[PDB]
Amino acid sequence: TDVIAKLDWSIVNEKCEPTIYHLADCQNWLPLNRWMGKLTFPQGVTSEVRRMP
Amino acid sequence: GCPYLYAIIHDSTTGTISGDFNLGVKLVGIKDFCGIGSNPGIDGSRLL
Amino acid sequence: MEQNLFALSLDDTSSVRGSLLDTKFAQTRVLLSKAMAGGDVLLDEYLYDVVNGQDFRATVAFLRTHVITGKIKVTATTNISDNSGCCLMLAINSGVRGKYSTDVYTICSQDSMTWNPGCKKNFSFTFNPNPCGDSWSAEMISRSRVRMTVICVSGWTLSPTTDVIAKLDWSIVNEKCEPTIYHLADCQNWLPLNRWMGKLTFPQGVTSEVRRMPLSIGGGAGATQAFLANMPNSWISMWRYFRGELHFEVTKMSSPYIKATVTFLIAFGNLSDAFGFYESFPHRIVQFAEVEEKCTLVFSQQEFVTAWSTQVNPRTTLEADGCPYLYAIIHDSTTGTISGDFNLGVKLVGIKDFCGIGSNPGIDGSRLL
Known part of the structure; x- marks a missing residue:
């Protein structure tokens, strides 16, 4: 049957911190969360390979 | 001339039920990033 | 500038060492049918030939090293859904002659490896191609015709949607190669036989089920109008009782x-x-977790009053037999939500504190299981 998933929105006790992007050429760490793709591998002994830019 | 992240099947996907072996690949971040010179730009990009 | 060349980093004789990356010298692709109940020969081939195509970091150095110092690590990759079973085996042997038996009992006498891709994803182990030395070369296992094999011991309890394949990662790992020689010493600290005991088959249903295995593993195993036997088993047959x-x-x-x-x-x-009251005799009860694959059975000296005949005459009634038997009884009842059988592989690996009694005159063939 169709199913459902519940959500429990709560305001937890944690400090809210900012996440800003600089133009500093050298960065200790920079987050991008850029998706790379949905890899799809069909069954069988097919010779399979995928490239991501 | 630019690197690629490769995903190769070592052995072979399989199962006792019709289906596909999907994989979500997400680049979360770059540690010790290093940006070189300003980019003039270039319209759009490869499609995947 | 110029320089003298007779004395350079050119006469290097040392064995290949490094990471499992510079050690990978062979990758063989072996396929599996969509259906194979048992005894199928997935792939047979001389060891040395496993390199033919291959071209990895270590490949080249593999052939060109006169004397290797490390064991070979073979690693298979292959997984199948939780709702399906199967059993494979990779076994190396020093040599082969004529139309040999590809059966299980025949190949697992020397270095072998068994497993179920249904519960344990990838299996691997290390072996020594030169069973009596501590060294071996590429040219070695090529000439002495070292044959390795791959067989299916028990079919799929359920058929996969498509054919599948399992890869192999042949590498020369950093471990000392040690010999495994058989003496004639009547009292031995430990003696390995790896003699297979049989493929136990328990049909579903509340059927009352029981199986006996001869502790008189002399002469070898059964076969129509002939017995087949590996070296070990064949060797222990040297003694009368044990x-x-x-x-x-x-x-x-x-x-x-x-x-x-x-x-x-x-x-x-x-x-x-x-009978029913087996449970009054000293025993061991065996259950299997959803994943557990292997279970070791140890039977100390206290389960035998005295030594027994290595091999007894085939035409011996089952009641006239006076030598112990390893019993396998169903405690409750085999079961499942899918048609299939509960197969069990029983292999006698070795005897601790062995004791061989007197030379055995012999006796042609042996009971058939």
């Missing part, structure tokens, strides 16, 4: 879906099939 601590490796080759509780023990032959 005894010692028995070790056993019982493997599950059926889908973890096929649940069943089996109980083992040592008892004699005259025992009825409708």
